[PDB]
Amino acid sequence: DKPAVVSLPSSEQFYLNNSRGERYLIQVSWPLHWKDHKPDTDRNDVPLIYIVDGNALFLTATEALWRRSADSHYCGGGIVVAIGYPLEGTGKVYHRVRRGFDLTVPTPDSPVEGHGGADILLDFIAETVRPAVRERFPDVSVSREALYGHSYGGLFALHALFTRPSMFDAYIASSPSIWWNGRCILNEAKAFTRKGAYTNGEKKLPSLMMYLGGLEQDPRRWNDEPDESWEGRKRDAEAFNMKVNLLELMGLIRGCTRLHAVSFSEYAGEDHGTVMACSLGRGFSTFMEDWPVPR
Template sequence: MEGAMEAPTPVVLPNSEQLYMKSIQDETYLIQMSWPLSWPKGRFHEGSAPIIYIVDGNALFLTATEAAWRRAAESRFVGGIVVAIGYPLSGKLYDSKRRSLDLTPPTATPIPGFGGADAFLDFIADVVKPHVTARFPHISLSREALYGHSYGGLLALHTLFTRNQLFDCYIASSPSVWWNDHCILEVARTFLRQDQPSDTTPSSLMVFWGSFEQDPPQWDDESLDQFESRKHIASIFRTREHSIQICEMLRGSHHLKTVFMHEFEGEEHTSVMAGSMARGLTEFFENWPSQG
């Protein structure tokens, strides 16, 4: 008899694990971690390794893990740890309500449902990071990065501007600079006016976006009205323009070691995530520090 030789079984991802953790606000998060396939017993690996923390983990954990593992065949391969922070979800990739709160910065006038970034960063710094350190006790974490897309990219910028020693590198993919009347730009200006303490190490920044985010084409089966609506939204978000503006503001600042930016031709807001993750992770793991 031809066909399957045995009953199908669930796909099991090696060298990975997940658990649920609670914040001080009693919110539950899904924490997923993976490490190189060459580490048969991750907790017993000895040496140093970079680590990348990723928000919107439900959507990006597998993308980041595969991007890291694929590099093992290359001579420049540097094995690292992937830590994805997401939510208890079933059948979907995003918790729109919680991510809107967690990934947006506080504002002078509170906006209901938004502005919880600082509490979320406290959770990462005080709960998630210590857990990762304890989970890999024989590993020296050589450097740490934060990756975020869209609102997550806004979070990466907010963290750089307000807690720039929390990570060594900030990877902002299609950052939502437009949010709340572009308030992150004033936070950036304040950051640039501050003195850099002599005992701190400058951070690095990478910013990515897709060319179709600001200049969308009309799809073959799309009506003119639908196309005009998408173009109008793109003209509000102005992802390319804002991303370049942020990078140009920061170039040459003593606060930053490097500023790297790249546009992915032919990608839009969701499709660019795979490219920005792979490129950002590879640059951070292997080409550190990026030359910008």
């Protein structure tokens, strides 16, 4: 009768190593109504979502999927793949150094120490993670794949789109850190747009879905917050320019024929942290239920 450990059903985790021998925690979850890994119905082709910063978002994505089974608009199923780090007994949900490297953009013209490991991570997902996850579901077809990331994760998702647009069907960038390294992601966006009237018209174009907390660009003052702290947060907001930078990015890629659709929605009253659950839930359900997103 005594208190017990909380163990999840319809989920599992395992460790994979990248080319460098760096260890990743892969956490996988799937619908509760499935019997083992096998779909309970003929509905056996389902969307799959990859989530970077896996340790911070796995449970949120998993429970969102499970709750969605009760909704009328339920697509019938989905698979969650959280790409995280070994943080057992650290008391942390982020690996600062690893994610710093893994999620930031390579700049070979001017290298940045401890950063620019996105291509190594993308290689790892394509070569190792994806096949390993498919091995787990022999009786499942995967209809489409989404990449979700928040902050540096969002920057990573934008990099993936602008350098490997055929790798995923959906790129979900929550509060993307477009500020990073002199806004060097805007260079990749410009190069992407710089690259079919006489073609047969057959293409497989990705969609970009972006989100932001309203309090990021426009913070609200806290209770009994000193003038020094308040002014500081207003300057940080200006420095990061989360909304300004996102609007500029959308300006660059608007009408780009290499893109199917670009969506953006802002959550009023949500901050950089609180928006994470909102954007992941909204993006994942859109990807599951309302695909494709209209032009």
